[PDB]
Amino acid sequence: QVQLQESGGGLVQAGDSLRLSCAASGFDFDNFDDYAIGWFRQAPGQEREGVSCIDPSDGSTIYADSAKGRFTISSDNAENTVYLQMNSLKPEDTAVYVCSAWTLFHSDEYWGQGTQVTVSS
């Protein structure tokens, strides 16, 4: 079907910032417009909690109560690729960041491979 690959994974000291980018491959019939995309972080042995999600068709941003004020998400509708930039990070944000996409009502839901983001200090 479609594979979602991520980028930006790397090391950063406390206070710095990063830009994780999720790209989705070509899809048949279904329009990237018809998909809502969210970022999920998975910490060692911790549950797969949701950080934020964006609806590209509407431009509506829905953030989680934990990462509100620091994290900012958007996309390029023509390029079919989303960008999540996180600022003022903490060592608590060390987790594998994967990219999910759900068609409305949670049919055609997809999960990616994920990139490692480790914060020092």
């Binding site: 969210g38 949701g50 950080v51 999600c53 829905i62 989680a64 759900w102 009502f105 949670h106």
Partner: peptide, 14 residues
Amino acid sequence: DRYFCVTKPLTYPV
């Protein structure tokens, strides 16, 4: 189910 998936879009599905 659809209601709960809609209202709390990040917490409920997980």
